[PDB]
Amino acid sequence: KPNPLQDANLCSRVFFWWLNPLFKIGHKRRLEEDDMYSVLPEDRSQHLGEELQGFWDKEVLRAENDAQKPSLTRAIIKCYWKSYLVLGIFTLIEESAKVIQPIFLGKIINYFENYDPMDSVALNTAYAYATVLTFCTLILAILHHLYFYHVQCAGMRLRVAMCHMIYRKALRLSNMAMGKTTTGQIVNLLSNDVNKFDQVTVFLHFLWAGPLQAIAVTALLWMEIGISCLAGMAVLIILLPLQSCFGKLFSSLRSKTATFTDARIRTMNEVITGIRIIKMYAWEKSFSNLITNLRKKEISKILRSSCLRGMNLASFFSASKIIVFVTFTTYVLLGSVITASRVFVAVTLYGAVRLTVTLFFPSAIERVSEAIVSIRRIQTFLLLDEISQRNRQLPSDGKKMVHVQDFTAFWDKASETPTLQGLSFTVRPGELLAVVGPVGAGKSSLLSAVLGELAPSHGLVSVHGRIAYVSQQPWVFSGTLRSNILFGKKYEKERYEKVIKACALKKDLQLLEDGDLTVIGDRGTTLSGGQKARVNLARAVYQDADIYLLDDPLSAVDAEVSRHLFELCICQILHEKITILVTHQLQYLKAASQILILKDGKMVQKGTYTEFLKSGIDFGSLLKKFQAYKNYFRAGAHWIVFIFLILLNTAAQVAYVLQDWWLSYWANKQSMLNTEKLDLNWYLGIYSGLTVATVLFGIARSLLVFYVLVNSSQTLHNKMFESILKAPVLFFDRNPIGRILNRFSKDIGHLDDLLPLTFLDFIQTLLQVVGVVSVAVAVIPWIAIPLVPLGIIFIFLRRYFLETSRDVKRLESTTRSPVFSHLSSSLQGLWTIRAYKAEERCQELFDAHQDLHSEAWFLFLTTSRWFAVRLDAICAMFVIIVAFGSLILAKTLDAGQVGLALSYALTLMGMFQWCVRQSAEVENMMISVERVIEYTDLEKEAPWEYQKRPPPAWPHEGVIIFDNVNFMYSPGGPLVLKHLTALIKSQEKVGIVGRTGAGKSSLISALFRLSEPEGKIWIDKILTTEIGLHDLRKKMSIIPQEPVLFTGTMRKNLDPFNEHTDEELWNALQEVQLKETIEDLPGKMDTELAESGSNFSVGQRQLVCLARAILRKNQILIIDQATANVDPRTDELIQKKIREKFAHCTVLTIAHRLNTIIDSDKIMVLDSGRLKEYDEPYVLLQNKESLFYKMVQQLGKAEAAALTETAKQVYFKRNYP
């Protein structure tokens, strides 16, 4: 994609003529990610990232070099001052040509001031000054566009480089660093807190050309009107401190808001992710009050951070109206009198200094004080504890091997007991090491140790070769399943077929519509747990490495699938490769070449299974211990308040214009004078009333617009949140977590503190354009004749540019999400990415994502600054007409009227494109109001509570009956359950088993009405559909497959509704034996449980859930594969404690482990979604042809026999006491 910019001369690069071809493309057909141009090789993400990383690395070096001052990313000005000063030339020429052109305004009004007789030489001089004024407003809207384009691209370079290096760090930060922060925080850096660099640079020059021009203004205004000018500049002085405690105090409010914003976003992430869990526990009205409190404490710091940009845009808008007022109050109270060349050169000078001192200077201060917090937090991030850069690979003897000697390491060094102590093992090619132990032993810690992800406190690890790592939790990332398996490796048909056949994925692909090409959704919500594990194992296998760190890929699959994987995949493909296997399945230890047993970081014994038999040690014992705009504004205040707002806007603009006209009328009344004097009391009285009516109306308008438009983003959010809290879970299945959290972070942020500001800005500058055009028309009515085509051209320019910039903005907004998505995905699988030496490849992929979004942003900037240059050409045509349609029609105009008209036409420039380029941006951040309204009308779930509530003690018995119940995930979707009729009596324990995909969890889903069932489900003769969702769900406890601990106190992970006392909480913890585990923490009830569940043991949080159940005392407990990733220790304690506690409660257990279910009072066997056998496990073992007995036998002969007598004993003891 050749960029025309590198093939564009200066003439066509100033006016962006080179972009005209692209526009010709977009006018007809849609623009897509291919039409864009590749960014210039000077500004790919890689070059920018490398440059700024070199500078910041030299900076962290310098900080730790003879200085010992802390490092400073904001002192990487050193990398942009050379190229972001050459942009100061444009500012210096522009803001010294906005002081020059007022002189020529005075000299063109002087023509009318003296007279306009039949004097050709004076009229020719006026023509010359008008031509000079025109070419000074053309060479001033080219230095306003070259500067304001190149500054936006010099801020884009900083944004892109900073994003690139945030990735380059987030790809190299150690375990502790990933513990201190989260993926939410890093993506917040990359998305919401690096964007500040697109705006820090824009106004950064007017920090010096703000005050400087002010001085110049006085240095040119004294010479006109004497000491009086000081007074005006005096009230200019007061603005700079006052309007900088509006840009630092505002930024203080903004950073004090951002903590509430991210607390709300994180809590919404909890809600969106564990929404299934929240529905099942009926916690909805408990996070309805934890976002309604991190919002109403947020919308108290937005009605103060926006009523402080109201006082900052109403101190800009009415800045020169105060400055001119004070100036001429002093100027006439000092004895002088008003002539409309002093006054209007003063007006157009004080306007040009209003723009810079009162807007660009406080905007620069605010952008710098809002980007300094961004830089501060990005240097907080960039100084995190990065992983130890892999020690130089010593000259190897070519022998690929793993060698671990006296290994000792801490996951957290502050912990007293090390994670591992004194591990020592050597693995040579062809050797299968199987790692066994209890829950929390450190087997995955061991594989991390071989990975180098666990820094040794003592001991040595020497690992040589390509390492393929399967994590204990399978990593499933966005992309096709074939691309998931490839992981960037080249696709080869035969070996891929062999691996898939080995990984038992052939049938799974066959039952899919698209087979292996199916696009797997985010986080693997389209797949099952066993499917995710198989995908992960296949991904590792395909890379055909040397050393394979397998972290128990068999605990997520049934017995037959796990045996298939161990035999065909592990024992055949990995028969010649170095392999370390973590396993809780003892059944494979007989086939392991070598075994290492680990307990509490103790290598208990290392050897072959035969040597372990010879010692007589039992392994079980070892393991047992327009409508959008109406819906937007009306969501704010009543339409009467909007009428008041329109009246207030159009009174502020009429007074801002009537003040200038009053100076003009005063000047005309002074011209036609004489003794005779002018009633100065009256004139200053009216001229002060107009200034006060401008100031107060500007303030009132800028506060009312913000109050209304923040009052709609407090209503749109409160009206969209309450709908996603009631969206049937099908909604969360279809739309990922990211696509729902985005419209609660990005879109609500836009509605909160970027749409009110953009919209008030657009309203205010549109009204000033209306004021300018109205002044010109009322002064030179003939202008209405050339203003008809001059508008039509604009009508054909807004169209012809919105046929493309509706697409380029679309490309940018849709290719911005691949960057963050790839960050999140590459950050979940970070350990796997560093396992392979694939840091550079992921760098290339992320720089390609950033390059694509840089192409999109480059076209956005250049199309906007093509639009703006043509708009300013139209606006200079307007200025030409006013400045020359006053000379050809000189004999008709006063000298105060030409001054008024021309000093308004001159201010049209630069302001026109900003009321036309914000409309095209108001209606683009208003398509983030289709999105926010999109979920305020979603199909809500069934009513939460019907009026006919169940009895308070219901269900007192606990009988669950199915009558011809069919479950489909979506209406008309494939049936997962088919014609179910069953009966579970009071307190009866029934397991539910089948192959992966048998309909197991789907019965749960139909029980909770996750998708509404056809059929009849009876609970103590109560139909499920006849009772509200919360009356039901609060009456069935559940332990899902992956229990979730939500951030905050353990109190709110147990009782965020506070329906109990601390006594019951401690009773529950002592009933889950977690009283001692948490009491050791300083926050016994209030430990800062952080998130993601990487700071707890896998097998313990499932206990908290039953403690939750213990609080709620439900007769119906529903367990869904709880002890799947747990050793026999908790794999017995949970069930025995349940039998002691849920003996009186109907238990509904789903699991693959037949040991955990062998004593179930009944079993529901599901095959492909139908209830095949419903009879006690002993009878199902009686039928030799039963699938249940086959599942038992597939585990091995002795183990199947053991299950046989176990079920036999349970049956006989139950039935024949």
Ligand X SMILES: Nc1ncnc2c1ncn2[C@@H]1O[C@H](COP(=O)(O)OP(=O)(O)OP(=O)(O)O)[C@@H](O)[C@H]1O
Number of H helices, E strands in the chain: 51, 21
How far CA 1006 is from CA of 15, 27, 526, 677, 1002, in Å, comes to 64, 51, 18, 92, 6
Q: Which two tokens stand for residue 329?
A: 């109050």
Q: Which window, 372-380, 460-468, 785-793, 1092-1100, contacts ligand X (CB under 6 A)?
A: 1092-1100
- Is 438 assigned a ligand-binding role in the annotation? yes
Residue 921 interacts with ligand PUC (CB under 6 A)? no
CB under 5 to 8 A by kind: which of Mg ion, ligand X, ligand PUC, none does 424 bind?
Answer: none
Q: Is 841 marked within a binding site?
A: no
- Residue 195 binds which of Mg ion, ligand X, ligand PUC, none (CB < 5-8 A, kind-dependent): none
Binding partner of residue 1125 among ligand PUC, ligand X, Mg ion, none, CB under 5 to 8 Å per kind? ligand X
Alpha-carbon distance of 890 to 920, in angstroms, equals 38
Can you state the percent helix, strand and coil of the chain, rounding each to 5?
Answer: 60, 10, 30
Which amino acid, 1129? R
The yes or no reply on residue 445 touching ligand X (CB under 6 A) is yes
Total residues contacting ligand PUC by CB under 6 A comes to 10
Q: How far is the CB of 255 from ligand X (least distance, A)?
A: 30
The listed partner (ligand PUC, ligand X, Mg ion, none) that binds 411, CB under 5 to 8 Å by sort, is ligand X
Q: What is the DSSP string of 760-810?
A: HHHHHHHHHHHHHHHHHHHH-GGGGTTHHHHHHHHHHHHHHHHHHHHHHHH
* Residue 911 interface partner, choices ligand X, Mg ion, ligand PUC, none, CB cut-off 5-8 Å depending on type: ligand PUC
Short-list 766, 764, 748, CA closest to 710: 748
- Neighbouring residues of 1068: CB distance < 8 A, sequence distance ≥ 6: 1054, 1107, 1110, 1111
Q: Is residue 1005 within the footprint of Mg ion (CB under 5 A)?
A: no
**DSSP letter assigned to residue 359:** I
| Contact between residue 290 and residue 1066 where contact means Cβ atoms under 8 Å apart | no
* Separation of alpha carbons 1151 and 1129, rounded Å: 16
Interface segment toward ligand PUC; rule CB under 6 A; list 266-274, 483-491, 839-847, 908-916: 908-916
Per-residue binding string, ligand X, 400-419, x by CB under 6 A, is -----------x-------x
Q: Could you say which of ligand PUC, Mg ion, ligand X, none residue 699 binds, taking C-beta under 5 to 8 angstroms by partner kind?
A: none
1001 is in an annotated binding site: yes
Cα(465)–Cα(448) distance, integer angstroms: 15
The DSSP call for residue 69 is P
Q: Is 890 helix (H, G, I), strand (E, B) or coil?
A: helix
Q: Which does 1094 bind (CB under 5 to 8 A by kind): ligand X, ligand PUC, Mg ion, none?
A: ligand X
User: Residue 992: CB partners within 8 Å, gap ≥ 6?
Assistant: 1000, 1003, 1148, 1149, 1150, 1163, 1164, 1166
Q: Is 997 annotated in some ligand binding site? A: yes
Question: Least CB distance from residue 347 to ligand PUC, whole Å?
Answer: 16
| 1001 lines the binding site for Mg ion (CB under 5 A) | yes
Q: How far is the CB of 472 from Mg ion (least distance, A)?
A: 4
Binding test (CB under 5 A) with Mg ion, winner from 188, 269, 472, 1102: 472
Distance CA 843, CA 595 (A): 38
Angle at 365 between CA 359 and CA 369, to 5 degrees: 140
Examine residue 181 and tell whether it contacts ligand X (CB under 6 A).
no
Q: For ligand X, which residue of 195, 525, 631, 966 counts as binding (CB under 6 A)?
A: 525
Q: Residue 119: which residues within 8 A CB-CB, separation 6 or more? A: none
Q: Does 583 bind Mg ion (CB under 5 A)?
A: no
Neighbours of 1123 (CB within 10 A): 27
Q: Out of 914, 962, 967, 1178, which residue is the one contacting ligand PUC (CB under 6 A)?
A: 914
Which of the residues 964 through 1023 are near ligand X (CB under 6 A)?
Answer: 969, 976, 996-1002
362 annotated among ligand-binding-site residues: no
Token pair 């944004």 in the structure block, residue: 159
147 vs 167 by CB, closer to ligand PUC: 147
| Smallest separation, CB 846 to ligand X (Å) | 24
H helices present in 171-248, as ranges: 175-180, 183-192, 206-225, 228-237, 239-242
Asked if 698 is part of the footprint of ligand PUC (rule: CB under 6 A), the reply reads no
Measured from the CB atom, is 443 or 809 closer to ligand X? 443
Quick one: which of 228, 269, 327, 363 contacts ligand PUC (CB under 6 A)? 363
| Residue (437 or 1015) nearer to ligand X, CB | 437
Helix residue ranges per DSSP H, 64-144: 88-94, 100-114, 120-138
95 is a site residue for ligand PUC (CB under 6 A): no
Q: Which of 102, 210, 310, 442 binds ligand X (CB under 6 A)?
A: 442
Asked if 594 interacts with ligand X (CB under 6 A), we say: no
CA 831 to CA 691: how far, in whole Å? 65
List residues bridging with 594 in a β-sheet. Answer: 433
Spell out, one character per residue from 765 to 794, where the chain touches ligand PUC: x when CB under 6 A holds, - when not: x-----------------------------
Window contacting ligand PUC (CB under 6 A); options: 637-645, 759-767, 821-829, 925-933: 759-767
What is the β-pairing status of strands 432-436 and 578-582?
Answer: parallel
Please calculate the CA angle 450-454-459 and round it to the nearest 5 degrees: 70
Nearer to Mg ion, 315 or 444 (CB): 444
Q: Which residue has the tokens 């995908």?
A: 535
Q: Cα separation of 1195 and 1153, whole Å?
A: 10
Give the number of residues in contact with ligand X, rule: CB under 6 A. Answer: 34
Known binder of ligand: residue 534? Answer: no
- Interface residues for ligand PUC in 631-650 (CB under 6 A)? none
Please state the closest distance from residue 1121 (CB atom) to Mg ion, in A. Answer: 6
Count the Cβ atoms, other than its own, within 10 Å of residue 1164: 25
Nearer to ligand PUC, 217 or 911 (CB): 911
Told to check if 440 binds ligand X by CB under 6 A, we report: yes
Compute φ and ψ for 421, nearest 5 degrees. Answer: -130, 130
Q: Is 221 in the site for ligand PUC (CB under 6 A)?
A: no
Decide whether 1040 or 1048 has the Cβ nearer to ligand X: 1040
Query: For residue 811, what are its two tokens?
Result: 């490309």
Q: Is 728 among the residues that bind ligand X (CB under 6 A)?
A: no
For residue 207, what are the contacts with CB-CB under 8 A and spacing of at least 6? Answer: 361, 364, 365, 368
To the nearest whole angstrom, how small is the minimum distance from the Cβ of residue 147 to ligand PUC? 8
Per CB under 6 A, does 1130 bind ligand X? no
The interface with ligand PUC within residues 951-990 (CB under 6 A) comprises none
Cβ 776 vs Cβ 897: under 8 Å: no
Residue span binding ligand PUC (CB under 6 A) among the ranges 709-717, 757-765, 983-991, 1185-1193: 757-765
371 binds ligand PUC, rule: CB under 6 A: no
Site for ligand PUC in 137-156 (CB under 6 A): 148
1000 assigned to a ligand binding site: yes
DSSP class of residue 167?
H
1095 binds ligand X (CB under 6 A): yes
Residue 420 has phi, psi (to 5 degrees) of -135, 145
Q: Give the DSSP H/E element, type plus range, for residue 1120.
A: strand 1116-1120
From CA 1073, how far away is CA 780, in angstroms rounded? Answer: 88
Nearest to 225 by CA among 214, 213, 233, 236: 233
In terms of CB distance, is 886 or 996 closer to ligand X?
Answer: 996
What is the helix (H) or strand (E) element at residue 711, kind and residue range?
helix 680-713
Question: Scanning residues 223 to 262, which ones bind ligand X (CB under 6 A)?
Answer: none
Annotated binding site: 437-444, 994-1001
Write out the residues near ligand X by the rule CB under 6 A.
175, 411, 419, 437, 439-445, 525-526, 528-530, 733, 969, 976, 996-1002, 1094-1095, 1097-1099, 1121, 1125, 1150
Write out the residues near ligand PUC by the rule CB under 6 A.
148, 313, 359, 363, 761, 764-765, 910-911, 914
Annotated binding site for ATP: 437-444, 994-1001
